[PDB]
């Protein structure tokens, strides 16, 4: 009976510590508490712009993480290496929290819980895996149905629809899960105006932000993924200039080193799922930014042990 409980229906730091320990021990958060986090976080997210704009004063830092894919024990490792989230220790998790990994429910409810506890200092951006098509195929819909009910998954889907699509730091660093656009002339204004509470279209700004990848050569190509595009160093350069930006931070691609600096330093990939699917053997990384110095400082980390549940 000693499960983690909300206090007056609200998330507290005490609750989060209890939750993370509960999840470490492979136990289930009660459906009614899961429900409350989901409805409350939907309210919080629905009030946000499609483009979150964050001001980082001279002394403040922020941590940017890439894909986590239900690798809950590696998530806790991030917090042990880099400290728990707080108003003095803000985080951005750049999409793809669920699917692939076997602890997606644990990752996402932990992330939502911290979103509720620190709404102004804990940021969640939508990934391509925070969608129906992907969830149906790649594990999350199954996991929710196994641990809770079909109805619970519908609520998760409707919550994902309210996740912002991009974040801009000090008007200079733009963060999105996928990347830049299939068409020329897209601006920050276009992004702000995206009605995001939906499943992504097959093409468009919303699709691109979740799906596109950088390529080494100039111009654009059809995506190997079958949706969106591959964009070259020249595409990046122009977009940044037209929008008065310094560089972009994206995720969406595994790197053996857990990060990649491409397009002449203008396109940065960060990936936070080490030894992805227990198979890839890749390192992962998180990024430190300061605002007195918006240049990314990379921190590589390796996978930690987890209980014997196979991917998917
Ligand atoms: C094309 C290969 C690039 O790496 C693929 C990675 C493995 C997972 O995370 C990314 C990729 C993505 O973000 O879409 C994969 C996935 O989420 O299915
Ligand atoms: Mn992705
Ligand atoms: Mn991914």
CSV table of C-alpha atoms and ligand atoms in Angstrom, one decimal:
chain,number,residue,atom,x,y,z
A,1,UNK,CA,0.0,0.0,0.0
A,2,UNK,CA,3.0,2.3,0.4
A,3,UNK,CA,3.1,3.7,-3.2
A,4,UNK,CA,4.0,7.2,-4.1
A,5,UNK,CA,1.2,9.7,-3.4
A,6,UNK,CA,0.4,13.2,-4.6
A,7,UNK,CA,0.1,15.8,-1.8
A,8,UNK,CA,-3.2,17.7,-2.2
A,9,UNK,CA,-3.2,16.3,-5.7
A,10,UNK,CA,0.2,18.1,-6.5
A,11,UNK,CA,3.7,16.9,-7.3
A,12,UNK,CA,6.4,17.6,-4.8
A,13,UNK,CA,10.2,16.9,-4.7
A,14,UNK,CA,9.4,14.2,-2.0
A,15,UNK,CA,7.0,12.6,-4.4
A,16,UNK,CA,9.5,12.6,-7.3
A,17,UNK,CA,12.2,10.9,-5.2
A,18,UNK,CA,9.6,8.3,-4.1
A,19,UNK,CA,8.5,7.8,-7.7
A,20,UNK,CA,12.0,7.3,-9.1
A,21,UNK,CA,12.8,4.8,-6.4
A,22,UNK,CA,9.4,3.0,-7.0
A,23,UNK,CA,10.3,2.8,-10.7
A,24,UNK,CA,13.8,1.6,-10.0
A,25,UNK,CA,12.2,-1.3,-8.2
A,26,UNK,CA,10.0,-2.0,-11.2
A,27,UNK,CA,6.7,-1.1,-9.4
A,28,UNK,CA,3.7,0.6,-11.0
A,29,UNK,CA,2.4,4.0,-10.1
A,30,UNK,CA,-1.3,3.8,-9.2
A,31,UNK,CA,-3.6,4.5,-12.2
A,32,UNK,CA,-5.3,7.4,-10.4
A,33,UNK,CA,-2.0,9.1,-9.7
A,34,UNK,CA,-0.9,8.5,-13.3
A,35,UNK,CA,-4.2,10.0,-14.5
A,36,UNK,CA,-3.7,13.1,-12.3
A,37,UNK,CA,-0.2,13.8,-13.7
A,38,UNK,CA,-1.4,13.3,-17.2
A,39,UNK,CA,-4.4,15.7,-16.9
A,40,UNK,CA,-2.4,18.3,-15.0
A,41,UNK,CA,0.5,18.2,-17.4
A,42,UNK,CA,-1.8,18.5,-20.4
A,43,UNK,CA,-3.1,21.7,-18.9
A,44,UNK,CA,0.4,23.1,-18.4
A,45,UNK,CA,1.6,22.1,-21.9
A,46,UNK,CA,-1.5,23.4,-23.7
A,47,UNK,CA,-0.9,26.9,-22.4
A,48,UNK,CA,2.6,26.9,-24.0
A,49,UNK,CA,3.7,28.3,-27.4
A,50,UNK,CA,4.7,25.9,-30.1
A,51,UNK,CA,8.1,27.7,-29.8
A,52,UNK,CA,9.2,28.0,-26.2
A,53,UNK,CA,11.5,31.0,-25.8
A,54,UNK,CA,13.8,30.9,-22.8
A,55,UNK,CA,16.1,33.6,-21.5
A,56,UNK,CA,19.3,32.4,-19.8
A,57,UNK,CA,20.9,35.1,-17.7
A,58,UNK,CA,24.7,35.5,-17.4
A,59,UNK,CA,25.1,33.0,-14.5
A,60,UNK,CA,22.4,30.5,-15.3
A,61,UNK,CA,23.1,27.1,-17.0
A,62,UNK,CA,20.9,24.6,-18.8
A,63,UNK,CA,21.3,21.0,-19.8
A,64,UNK,CA,20.1,19.7,-23.1
A,65,UNK,CA,19.4,15.9,-23.6
A,66,UNK,CA,18.5,14.0,-26.7
A,67,UNK,CA,16.5,10.7,-27.3
A,68,UNK,CA,16.0,8.6,-24.2
A,69,UNK,CA,13.7,5.9,-25.6
A,70,UNK,CA,12.4,4.4,-22.3
A,71,UNK,CA,15.9,3.7,-21.0
A,72,UNK,CA,14.8,4.7,-17.5
A,73,UNK,CA,17.9,3.5,-15.7
A,74,UNK,CA,20.1,5.6,-18.0
A,75,UNK,CA,17.8,8.5,-17.3
A,76,UNK,CA,18.5,8.2,-13.5
A,77,UNK,CA,22.2,8.0,-14.4
A,78,UNK,CA,21.9,11.4,-16.1
A,79,UNK,CA,20.5,12.8,-12.9
A,80,UNK,CA,23.2,11.2,-10.8
A,81,UNK,CA,26.0,12.5,-13.1
A,82,UNK,CA,24.4,15.9,-13.7
A,83,UNK,CA,22.2,16.4,-10.6
A,84,UNK,CA,18.4,16.3,-10.2
A,85,UNK,CA,16.3,18.9,-12.0
A,86,UNK,CA,15.6,22.2,-10.1
A,87,UNK,CA,15.2,25.9,-10.6
A,88,UNK,CA,19.0,26.2,-10.5
A,89,UNK,CA,19.5,23.0,-12.6
A,90,UNK,CA,17.2,23.2,-15.6
A,91,UNK,CA,16.8,20.5,-18.3
A,92,UNK,CA,15.5,20.2,-21.9
A,93,UNK,CA,14.6,16.7,-23.1
A,94,UNK,CA,14.5,16.8,-26.9
A,95,UNK,CA,11.9,14.3,-27.9
A,96,UNK,CA,11.8,10.5,-28.3
A,97,UNK,CA,11.2,9.7,-24.6
A,98,UNK,CA,9.2,6.5,-25.4
A,99,UNK,CA,9.3,3.5,-27.7
A,100,UNK,CA,12.2,1.0,-28.2
A,101,UNK,CA,13.1,0.8,-24.5
A,102,UNK,CA,11.1,-1.4,-22.1
A,103,UNK,CA,10.7,1.3,-19.4
A,104,UNK,CA,8.9,4.0,-21.5
A,105,UNK,CA,6.1,4.5,-19.0
A,106,UNK,CA,8.7,5.0,-16.3
A,107,UNK,CA,10.7,7.6,-18.3
A,108,UNK,CA,7.6,9.6,-19.5
A,109,UNK,CA,5.8,9.8,-16.1
A,110,UNK,CA,9.1,10.8,-14.5
A,111,UNK,CA,9.6,13.5,-17.1
A,112,UNK,CA,5.9,14.7,-16.8
A,113,UNK,CA,6.3,14.7,-13.0
A,114,UNK,CA,9.4,16.9,-13.2
A,115,UNK,CA,7.6,19.1,-15.7
A,116,UNK,CA,4.8,19.7,-13.1
A,117,UNK,CA,7.3,20.2,-10.3
A,118,UNK,CA,9.4,22.7,-12.2
A,119,UNK,CA,7.3,24.1,-15.1
A,120,UNK,CA,9.6,27.0,-15.9
A,121,UNK,CA,12.9,25.0,-15.6
A,122,UNK,CA,12.1,21.6,-17.1
A,123,UNK,CA,11.3,21.4,-20.8
A,124,UNK,CA,10.0,18.7,-23.0
A,125,UNK,CA,10.0,19.0,-26.8
A,126,UNK,CA,8.1,16.6,-29.0
A,127,UNK,CA,9.9,13.9,-30.9
A,128,UNK,CA,8.7,11.8,-33.9
A,129,UNK,CA,8.1,9.0,-31.4
A,130,UNK,CA,5.6,11.1,-29.5
A,131,UNK,CA,3.0,10.2,-32.2
A,132,UNK,CA,0.4,7.5,-32.9
A,133,UNK,CA,1.9,5.7,-35.9
A,134,UNK,CA,5.3,5.3,-34.1
A,135,UNK,CA,3.7,4.3,-30.7
A,136,UNK,CA,1.5,1.6,-32.4
A,137,UNK,CA,4.6,-0.1,-33.9
A,138,UNK,CA,7.5,0.6,-31.6
A,139,UNK,CA,6.4,-0.4,-28.1
A,140,UNK,CA,4.8,2.4,-26.2
A,141,UNK,CA,1.1,1.7,-27.0
A,142,UNK,CA,1.8,-2.0,-26.1
A,143,UNK,CA,3.5,-1.0,-22.8
A,144,UNK,CA,0.7,1.3,-21.7
A,145,UNK,CA,-1.9,-1.3,-22.6
A,146,UNK,CA,0.1,-3.9,-20.6
A,147,UNK,CA,0.6,-1.7,-17.5
A,148,UNK,CA,-2.6,0.2,-17.6
A,149,UNK,CA,-5.5,0.2,-20.2
A,150,UNK,CA,-6.2,1.2,-23.8
A,151,UNK,CA,-7.9,4.4,-22.5
A,152,UNK,CA,-4.7,5.4,-20.6
A,153,UNK,CA,-2.8,5.3,-23.9
A,154,UNK,CA,-5.4,7.6,-25.6
A,155,UNK,CA,-4.7,10.1,-22.8
A,156,UNK,CA,-0.9,9.8,-23.4
A,157,UNK,CA,-1.4,10.5,-27.1
A,158,UNK,CA,-3.6,13.5,-26.4
A,159,UNK,CA,-0.9,14.8,-24.0
A,160,UNK,CA,1.9,14.3,-26.5
A,161,UNK,CA,-0.1,16.5,-29.0
A,162,UNK,CA,0.5,19.5,-26.6
A,163,UNK,CA,4.2,19.1,-26.4
A,164,UNK,CA,6.1,22.2,-27.9
A,165,UNK,CA,7.9,21.6,-31.2
A,166,UNK,CA,11.0,23.8,-30.6
A,167,UNK,CA,12.8,25.9,-28.1
A,168,UNK,CA,14.9,29.0,-28.6
A,169,UNK,CA,17.6,30.1,-26.0
A,170,UNK,CA,18.5,33.8,-25.9
A,171,UNK,CA,17.3,34.2,-29.5
A,172,UNK,CA,20.4,32.4,-30.6
A,173,UNK,CA,20.1,28.6,-30.2
A,174,UNK,CA,17.2,26.8,-31.7
A,175,UNK,CA,16.4,23.3,-30.5
A,176,UNK,CA,14.1,20.8,-32.2
A,177,UNK,CA,14.0,17.0,-32.4
A,178,UNK,CA,14.5,16.4,-36.1
A,179,UNK,CA,15.8,19.5,-37.9
A,180,UNK,CA,15.2,22.1,-40.6
A,181,UNK,CA,12.8,22.5,-43.4
A,182,UNK,CA,11.9,21.0,-46.8
A,183,UNK,CA,11.2,24.6,-48.1
A,184,UNK,CA,13.2,27.8,-48.0
A,185,UNK,CA,11.9,30.9,-46.1
A,186,UNK,CA,10.6,29.3,-42.9
A,187,UNK,CA,11.0,31.7,-39.9
A,188,UNK,CA,10.5,31.6,-36.1
A,189,UNK,CA,7.1,33.3,-36.7
A,190,UNK,CA,6.0,30.3,-38.8
A,191,UNK,CA,7.0,27.9,-36.0
A,192,UNK,CA,5.1,30.0,-33.3
A,193,UNK,CA,2.0,29.8,-35.5
A,194,UNK,CA,1.9,26.0,-36.0
A,195,UNK,CA,-1.3,24.6,-34.5
A,196,UNK,CA,0.5,21.6,-33.0
A,197,UNK,CA,-2.3,19.8,-31.1
A,198,UNK,CA,-2.5,17.0,-33.7
A,199,UNK,CA,-0.7,14.1,-35.3
A,200,UNK,CA,2.0,15.4,-37.7
A,201,UNK,CA,1.1,15.9,-41.4
A,202,UNK,CA,2.9,13.9,-44.1
A,203,UNK,CA,4.8,17.1,-45.1
A,204,UNK,CA,5.1,20.6,-43.7
A,205,UNK,CA,7.0,22.6,-41.0
A,206,UNK,CA,5.5,20.4,-38.2
A,207,UNK,CA,6.6,17.2,-40.0
A,208,UNK,CA,10.1,18.6,-40.7
A,209,UNK,CA,10.8,19.6,-37.1
A,210,UNK,CA,10.1,16.0,-36.0
A,211,UNK,CA,11.6,14.1,-38.9
A,212,UNK,CA,14.4,15.8,-41.0
A,213,UNK,CA,18.1,14.9,-40.9
A,214,UNK,CA,21.3,16.9,-41.9
A,215,UNK,CA,23.3,15.7,-44.8
A,216,UNK,CA,27.0,16.5,-45.6
A,217,UNK,CA,26.4,17.8,-49.2
A,218,UNK,CA,24.7,21.0,-50.2
A,219,UNK,CA,20.9,21.3,-51.0
A,220,UNK,CA,18.2,18.8,-50.2
A,221,UNK,CA,17.4,15.1,-50.7
A,222,UNK,CA,14.4,12.8,-50.2
A,223,UNK,CA,14.7,11.3,-46.7
A,224,UNK,CA,15.8,7.7,-46.4
A,225,UNK,CA,13.0,7.5,-43.8
A,226,UNK,CA,10.3,8.2,-46.5
A,227,UNK,CA,9.1,11.4,-44.9
A,228,UNK,CA,10.5,15.0,-44.7
A,229,UNK,CA,13.9,15.7,-46.1
A,230,UNK,CA,17.7,15.7,-45.7
A,231,UNK,CA,19.2,19.2,-45.6
A,232,UNK,CA,22.7,20.4,-46.4
A,233,UNK,CA,25.1,22.9,-44.8
A,234,UNK,CA,23.9,25.7,-47.1
A,235,UNK,CA,20.3,25.1,-46.0
A,236,UNK,CA,21.3,25.4,-42.3
A,237,UNK,CA,23.5,28.5,-43.0
A,238,UNK,CA,20.7,30.5,-44.7
A,239,UNK,CA,18.0,29.5,-42.2
A,240,UNK,CA,20.2,30.7,-39.3
A,241,UNK,CA,21.1,34.0,-41.0
A,242,UNK,CA,17.5,34.7,-42.0
A,243,UNK,CA,16.4,34.1,-38.4
A,244,UNK,CA,19.4,35.8,-36.6
A,245,UNK,CA,20.4,32.5,-34.9
A,246,UNK,CA,23.8,31.1,-34.0
A,247,UNK,CA,23.3,27.3,-34.5
A,248,UNK,CA,20.8,24.5,-34.0
A,249,UNK,CA,20.7,21.6,-31.5
A,250,UNK,CA,18.8,18.5,-32.7
A,251,UNK,CA,18.6,14.8,-31.9
A,252,UNK,CA,16.8,12.0,-33.8
A,253,UNK,CA,20.0,10.1,-34.9
A,254,UNK,CA,22.2,7.7,-33.0
A,255,UNK,CA,26.0,8.5,-32.9
A,256,UNK,CA,28.6,6.1,-31.6
A,257,UNK,CA,30.0,9.0,-29.6
A,258,UNK,CA,26.5,10.2,-28.6
A,259,UNK,CA,26.9,13.6,-30.4
A,260,UNK,CA,28.0,15.1,-33.7
A,261,UNK,CA,29.1,18.6,-34.7
A,262,UNK,CA,28.2,19.2,-38.3
A,263,UNK,CA,27.6,21.9,-41.0
A,264,UNK,CA,30.7,23.8,-39.9
A,265,UNK,CA,29.6,23.8,-36.2
A,266,UNK,CA,26.1,25.0,-37.2
A,267,UNK,CA,24.2,21.7,-36.7
A,268,UNK,CA,24.7,19.8,-33.5
A,269,UNK,CA,23.3,16.4,-32.8
A,270,UNK,CA,22.8,15.2,-29.2
A,271,UNK,CA,21.7,11.6,-28.4
A,272,UNK,CA,21.1,10.5,-24.8
A,273,UNK,CA,20.3,6.8,-25.1
A,274,UNK,CA,23.6,4.9,-24.4
A,275,UNK,CA,24.0,1.3,-25.8
A,276,UNK,CA,20.7,1.9,-27.6
A,277,UNK,CA,18.3,-1.1,-27.5
A,278,UNK,CA,21.0,-3.0,-25.5
A,279,UNK,CA,22.7,-3.5,-28.9
A,280,UNK,CA,24.2,-0.4,-30.7
A,281,UNK,CA,27.0,-0.1,-28.1
A,282,UNK,CA,27.0,3.7,-28.6
A,283,UNK,CA,27.9,6.3,-25.9
A,284,UNK,CA,25.4,9.0,-25.1
A,285,UNK,CA,25.8,12.6,-24.3
A,286,UNK,CA,24.2,15.7,-22.7
A,287,UNK,CA,25.0,19.3,-23.4
A,288,UNK,CA,25.8,22.2,-21.0
A,289,UNK,CA,25.0,25.8,-22.0
A,290,UNK,CA,25.5,29.0,-20.0
A,291,UNK,CA,24.3,32.1,-21.8
A,292,UNK,CA,27.5,33.9,-20.9
A,293,UNK,CA,28.7,31.2,-23.4
A,294,UNK,CA,26.0,29.6,-25.5
A,295,UNK,CA,28.7,27.3,-27.0
A,296,UNK,CA,27.9,23.6,-26.3
A,297,UNK,CA,29.9,21.7,-23.7
A,298,UNK,CA,29.5,17.9,-24.3
A,299,UNK,CA,29.4,15.3,-21.6
A,300,UNK,CA,29.7,11.7,-22.7
A,301,UNK,CA,28.2,8.8,-20.7
A,302,UNK,CA,27.9,5.0,-20.9
A,303,UNK,CA,25.0,2.7,-20.2
A,304,UNK,CA,24.3,1.4,-16.7
A,305,UNK,CA,22.8,-2.0,-15.8
A,306,UNK,CA,19.0,-2.5,-15.9
A,307,UNK,CA,16.7,-5.3,-14.9
A,308,UNK,CA,16.3,-8.2,-17.3
A,309,UNK,CA,13.5,-7.0,-19.5
A,310,UNK,CA,14.3,-7.2,-23.2
A,311,UNK,CA,13.7,-4.3,-25.6
A,312,UNK,CA,10.0,-4.3,-26.7
B,1,LIG,C1,19.3,6.6,-39.4
B,1,LIG,C2,20.0,6.1,-38.2
B,1,LIG,C3,20.1,7.2,-37.1
B,1,LIG,O1,20.0,6.7,-35.8
B,1,LIG,C4,18.7,6.3,-35.4
B,1,LIG,C5,18.4,6.5,-34.0
B,1,LIG,C6,17.8,5.2,-33.3
B,1,LIG,C7,16.5,5.7,-32.8
B,1,LIG,O2,16.8,7.1,-32.4
B,1,LIG,C8,17.3,7.5,-33.7
B,1,LIG,C9,16.0,7.2,-34.6
B,1,LIG,C10,15.0,8.4,-34.5
B,1,LIG,O3,15.2,9.3,-33.6
B,1,LIG,O4,14.1,8.4,-35.2
B,1,LIG,C11,15.5,5.9,-33.9
B,1,LIG,C12,14.1,5.9,-33.6
B,1,LIG,O5,13.6,6.7,-32.8
B,1,LIG,O6,13.4,5.0,-34.1
B,2,LIG,MN1,13.6,10.6,-33.7
B,3,LIG,MN1,14.8,8.3,-31.5
